[PDB]
Amino acid sequence: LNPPPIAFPSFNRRCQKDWLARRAFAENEVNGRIYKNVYQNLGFKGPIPILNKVGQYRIRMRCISGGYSRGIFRFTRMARMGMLQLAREGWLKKYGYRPGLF
Amino acid sequence: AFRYRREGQFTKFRVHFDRSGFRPYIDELKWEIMDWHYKRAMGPQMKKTLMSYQEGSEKLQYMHDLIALGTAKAKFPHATKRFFFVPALPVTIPYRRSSNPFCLLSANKTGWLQWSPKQRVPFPQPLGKRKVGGTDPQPPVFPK
Amino acid sequence: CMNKKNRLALRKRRRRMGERVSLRYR
Amino acid sequence: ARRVGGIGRRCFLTLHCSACSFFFQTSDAIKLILTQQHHILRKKGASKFSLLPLADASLLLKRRGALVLRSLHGDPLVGSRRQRGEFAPQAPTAEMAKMLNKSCVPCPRCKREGRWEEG
Amino acid sequence: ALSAYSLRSLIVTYNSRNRSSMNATIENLKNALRWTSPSESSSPSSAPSSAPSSAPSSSWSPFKYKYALRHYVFEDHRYAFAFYDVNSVQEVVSAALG
Amino acid sequence: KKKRGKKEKVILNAEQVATKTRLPPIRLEDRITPEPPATVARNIRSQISRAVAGWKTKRMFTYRNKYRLRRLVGMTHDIDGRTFVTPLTKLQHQAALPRSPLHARFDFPHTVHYDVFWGPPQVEEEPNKSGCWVSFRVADLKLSDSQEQRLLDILGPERYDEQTGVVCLEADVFPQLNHNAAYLGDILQQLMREVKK
Amino acid sequence: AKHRFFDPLFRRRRLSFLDRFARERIKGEKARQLGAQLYVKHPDQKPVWP
Amino acid sequence: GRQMMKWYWPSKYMLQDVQMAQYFQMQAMRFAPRPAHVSLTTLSATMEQCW
Amino acid sequence: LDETLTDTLLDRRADLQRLRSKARLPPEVLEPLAAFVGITRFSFDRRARL
Amino acid sequence: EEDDSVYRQFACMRRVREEPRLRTALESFKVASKNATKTRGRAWSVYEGWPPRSRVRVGDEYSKVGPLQRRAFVFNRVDGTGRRREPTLAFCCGNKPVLLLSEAEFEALVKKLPWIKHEMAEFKKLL
Amino acid sequence: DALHPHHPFRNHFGFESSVPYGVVGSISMGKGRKKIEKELARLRYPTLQRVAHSLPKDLKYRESVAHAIRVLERSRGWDFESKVKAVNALVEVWNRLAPGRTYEKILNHAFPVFRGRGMVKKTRSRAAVFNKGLKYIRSLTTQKPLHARLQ
Amino acid sequence: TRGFRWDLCQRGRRRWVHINYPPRNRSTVQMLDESHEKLVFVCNGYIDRLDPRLLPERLRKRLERNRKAALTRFDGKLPWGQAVESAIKRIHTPCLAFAQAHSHHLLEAFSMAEVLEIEKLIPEIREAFKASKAKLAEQEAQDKFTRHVSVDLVDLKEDPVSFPFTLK
RNA sequence: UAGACUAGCGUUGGAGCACAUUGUUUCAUUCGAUAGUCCACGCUCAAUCUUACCAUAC
RNA sequence: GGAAGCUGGAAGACGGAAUCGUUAUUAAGCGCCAGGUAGUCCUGGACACUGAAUCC
RNA sequence: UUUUUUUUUUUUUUU
RNA sequence: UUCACCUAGCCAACACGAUCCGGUUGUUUGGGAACAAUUCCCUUCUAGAAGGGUAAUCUAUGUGCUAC
RNA sequence: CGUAGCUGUAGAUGAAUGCUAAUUAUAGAGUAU
RNA sequence: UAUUGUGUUAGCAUGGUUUCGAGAACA
RNA sequence: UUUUUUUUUUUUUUUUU
């Protein structure tokens, strides 16, 4: 019929939510170290509830040509189908991709 | 013992991504794949508008030159052609101004590049009967 | 390291670094 | 066959001394500093005097004393499961040597000032 | 002193993602030589740096119990050159980049 | 079939007056702004008082024992306005710079190496392209017996090769090439000042 | 002359609704009301663009 | 902070518009001169003072 | 085929091979060396130096 | 190589050769720093000049140890931004789980006081 | 030394380079250098001496913050802008706390070297009792569909 | 799929007075809309206290050793009242509390006797607000400079590479 | 002329994940049925987010 | 959730029957890490050494 | 090497 | 890159898409089971002592028993 | 690197490794016996 | 440098891409 | 290696004043 236009992903509420946490953590990244420094100097271990909603671990891998949050690698940043379509459309040849080898 | 046939085995299964000479490729493709669609949709459209009004096209350009520089440096008599308009498009890729004297874009002093009106070697060459995505404006139809 | 193969590897690895770990069971 | 130190007879847990001839593992380092606490406290010149009870020789051999020594010694040789390949643990004697020399702890063999070294 | 300095050596390295692209560079570099003012042009030495490769893994169609796999090989090429007694900096740096 | 049966709005009683009148609680979207310094300090005082109230844990007493150990050895900032001078600024003040290109600063051979990336216009900068190091042979450098030993002791055996007899000094604490290059030249001169003593 | 660029995925979707607007039968009043404010005007001729 | 930001696709509603009004202005100003001579002007009208 | 062989045609021409060894020195040649000695009285640019 | 026969005969070059001590330079920096940052330098000014918690009325506020009360409780609470200023009335014991905020909330309590007084009697007092 | 009254020092300023800067073509063509970036463009290398203007009066807190200045300025990974903000907010949070002479006394008395038989303070804290079902308490005042009472 | 926090499965700070949060015969709230915080409502109170005097010799010795000591042990109280309920004295007394608008959480409760005392002290508490207003102006000047910032170096900055220096 | 035979060798217990009977206001919608798009399914990793579910309310 | 000290009388020497298949650097054993963007498996992917027999 | 050593072996490299 | 060639032997939860349906279609704070006999003793308190219970069935995988 | 070769012990009728008053490490938070 | 609803009935018996299971490629 | 811009409780989020 007509394979998707891989440059512009469709709408996804969950996909957009993941990117929202990235901006919050970047601005609050400085405050994270201050909370650990004060406790270390005083010699007392305590929780940091404020880091729950702006923590680095809240963000996880997601598919750009997708919206699933599983089966995404750090090298390709795509799902099983995302890589297949990209490789079969003739776009990785310039980037040194020879499918002849197993 | 095959030495050349087994080259690169060490840096395939016993090496870290951050501790190897391999560079990422997704970063470059991010800004390259998007720009292809921009030139395709806006390519024919820009040329159609330029050719919409054949005559009287050079009058607007001549008057504009009298405001920027005042004196028309490229002035010519009525018996000589002024210029040929070439359909160009803006640059969207955020390239870095490198100090390479042999580069083709490092010495760019404008935000417009020429567009090829005809190409015989399509860059997005398919490996089979599959078509290019986003190249079917008209919706499909079924026999029903 | 749940099985006896991977778990015993940690104890043997430390033995080559200048430490003595009891071995015996598991 | 099953020697300690491997083929190259590695030793990443012992520290040598410039004076005399005596070496000990990091395990005994914790006990030595705690036992010789009276000399260290008087050298500098309640919250400060908190580890006084731990100076007892018999208390260290009891159940309570055994747990205190193990708490301080975190077993640096043990680490995460992903620390494999080039990311292998190194000798932690660099940190131990600094503390042992700065605290000015006497050597059991001969009473001397900071004379310890990595080895 | 700045005026007392001299370029002892200039190690030039390349990184090409295709076999044909790397071959074109060798021919282009050779053509730039044999054209300088001195009788003998600068002739750098060759030093190949192997060919690293990478190929991730992924399960293969969805809704399967991992019966088949599909790999994507991504080869690479490298090349290194050595220089000694680079008296002319303009005739060497420009040629390598060009 | 399923997941379609709607429900009427049962929230219509007059008792529920405090509804749809004020903005909901703080949302994750509004958390983009940073926390002011006044609020960060408040949380420390509230939490420290709760732990001492009786909220203890098995893994809390062990942390305190480790901290007390560093006090005896003398690795704590505990004492039984100020305007100090940073170490970086101190080195800048004490530096004999050359007066023009024709004056030799150093009095010994030295080689400077640095990697420069060149290629097509890349959308992103390549990291690990700002290294600068200096190498020199101890044998060529004429020095006394006492001075020679101190040179290798300060840098240690890691930066010294026993085969050829050369010392390599590497400095990379800046992202920029120009900033890093100047830093190496300052520390190098300071080393010779203390060696000759 | 102005020509605003639009997402290629939106171009095909626009024609899909317009094709069946005056040709086929569309059920539901909400679909026609909401569908008459996004594809009824050209992207370049719109008064406001996101 | 800067590592996690490098994800997903960039914005699409911030591209340069293909406006005909701006096209003519760019062509008219393309043939402008370069009367900078920042260095030459300083040296000029200086030799006479020394003489 | 002729379209793909355009690059080889320019390389084979001997006229272009003469100007290959004549270009501007990259800025990142002598600038790093100048900072090593710690001199604040030299400008790489020729126009600015004058 | 440095020639000392020229610097001694000229004062302009002598200054460059001379390296002022850090003590002299540090003295000037203190004056310049204070002049630029004239509106900064003090952070915690609610030091014991007024003792924290409260100073107007202290002791026997809410400690449920005896019948009836003796005095009220009033003090100030620092805002989350450190610029605003509001009073406080509620004080249970040190922690103050409940805060009555400024007099805006206390005003409504007086208006509603007679209403609750007449309701509690007929609510469960008689049962 | 007189080149800048706000920074009395011998060597502070360097020389500017001729390295091209900017984007070839994008929505940010007219950007050049930032307000803070221009400062480092005319300096030999960045420092961390400007932040040190006022420090906590307490000796314990003064040394804790002072040590961080010497290490941060000689570390790779932190941006110039982040370094200033990291220390600027650190001096304020420390000043809004009780003196260290009192913090240690409270912690030492409340945390003895040896534990006891009842120092945990957590008893009968089962998992499948309170917050694992049993359909019981609702923390809610206004409830039309009373589930607790219906059952 | 385990729980996030284990603190919710433990008893927090004692409320002194125990009141049943779920109402059965509560009236309708009034006002407290613009503020949208700390709503006012009436409920039923239930006071409870423990006086360790009637305990046996066996249990009294252990109880006192935990309560009157250097540190608290086992919360300084016995387990559930399996056999001590005989000495437990509780008196029913109507009381009231406050709850959050959206959060719907209990803050605290007050006895009926204490409520009447507040009315009698209205004249005494009203005049106390005047003293706070006096210090409002004094604290404004001191709390405004509570912002540490780095000294500005740029000074609308020069280009001081070598030239300009005669321009200065 | 494969399986059938000739060597080696893993099992009727105790343990990890998962399907199912029995609990659930929520315990993840599901594939395939007997030589398998069935048990780490699109779980290349679930201690918050990933999570679609229920409760609560804006 | 992973590992470790101490402590140790958790359920097993049943069956030479029967069902899953290997085209030899196959089979049988043993040892190591690369990715899964803090830890986090006995499965999957991937490398190396000892390496027998039969009528297939 | 009759003043010499005092010993097991890996999965990229002396281009 | 057997892009090939038949399919009574596929997902609507990666995505596009024919038709029906339209849950302020999102968000704040929580939960998402397999393991009860309480700090049990008139012998004791600023150096260690006495009690902890669901026995219901399958598939696929690590680890063990061998000589009188 | 592991079973090494070599070489001491008991030429194991008794080597099964799960249960747990209790600590090691990552993490903002994995707690109670 | 985020921006055009629905992770809902309906795929073996009308479906585009991919693929498991059986069969075939010679003159 | 160089030490300071101003400042009132036992009641430092545990005591019947």
Side-chain angles (χ1 to χ4, degrees), chain B residues 5 8 13 17 39 52 55 63 73 76 91 97-98 128 135:
Chain B
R5 196 165 72 162
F13 306 130
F17 183 50
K39 289 192 175 85
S52 65
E55 64 183 68
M63 293 161 80
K73 287 181 174 289
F76 273 111
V91 193
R97 281 187 178 285
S98 68
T135 64

Side-chain angles (χ1 to χ4, degrees), chain J residues 71-123:
Chain J
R71 64 189 64 196
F73 209 94
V74 66
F75 64 101
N76 285 295
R77 185 98 288 198
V78 73
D79 213 60
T81 51
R83 320 206 91 203
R84 286 92 188 82
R85 194 83 274 175
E86 54 274 10
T88 297
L89 180 66
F91 172 83
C92 165
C93 198
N95 59 347
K96 319 178 203 76
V98 55
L99 301 175
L100 280 167
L101 264 289
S102 73
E103 61 170 70
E105 301 188 14
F106 186 74
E107 182 263 19
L109 195 147
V110 173
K111 194 182 286 179
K112 258 186 163 198
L113 191 70
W115 182 56
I116 306 302
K117 185 177 182 175
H118 292 310
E119 181 175 0
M120 61 175 69
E122 72 203 345
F123 179 65

Side-chain angles (χ1 to χ4, degrees), chain D residues 86-98:
Chain D
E86 199 179 352
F87 302 98
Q90 292 196 141
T93 49
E95 195 70 22
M96 195 69 93
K98 193 70 167 182

Side-chain angles (χ1 to χ4, degrees), chain J:
Chain J
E1 294 94 323
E2 190 72 86
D3 189 17
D4 312 81
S5 182
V6 178
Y7 287 82
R8 291 168 179 278
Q9 295 293 320
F10 287 94
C12 302
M13 294 168 58
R14 198 170 61 202
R15 191 68 170 161
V16 178
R17 200 172 185 185
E18 195 171 3
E19 292 163 42
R21 210 184 181 210
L22 293 161
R23 187 178 178 186
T24 311
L26 191 71
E27 185 163 49
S28 182
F29 183 71
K30 292 174 186 174
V31 186
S33 184
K34 290 173 187 182
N35 277 287
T37 61
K38 213 169 193 171
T39 55
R40 301 95 176 198
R42 299 190 290 89
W44 197 38
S45 214
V46 69
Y47 147 90
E48 223 70 8
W50 176 294
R53 284 152 294 291
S54 60
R55 178 52 156 194
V56 187
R57 301 292 175 267
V58 302
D60 191 34
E61 167 52 30
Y62 257 53
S63 175
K64 283 212 172 180
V65 73
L68 273 72
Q69 304 190 14
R70 207 176 300 192
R71 64 189 64 196
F73 209 94
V74 66
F75 64 101
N76 285 295
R77 185 98 288 198
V78 73
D79 213 60
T81 51
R83 320 206 91 203
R84 286 92 188 82
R85 194 83 274 175
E86 54 274 10
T88 297
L89 180 66
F91 172 83
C92 165
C93 198
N95 59 347
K96 319 178 203 76
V98 55
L99 301 175
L100 280 167
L101 264 289
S102 73
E103 61 170 70
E105 301 188 14
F106 186 74
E107 182 263 19
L109 195 147
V110 173
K111 194 182 286 179
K112 258 186 163 198
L113 191 70
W115 182 56
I116 306 302
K117 185 177 182 175
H118 292 310
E119 181 175 0
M120 61 175 69
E122 72 203 345
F123 179 65
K124 276 198 176 199
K125 234 291 188 178
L126 307 177
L127 71 87

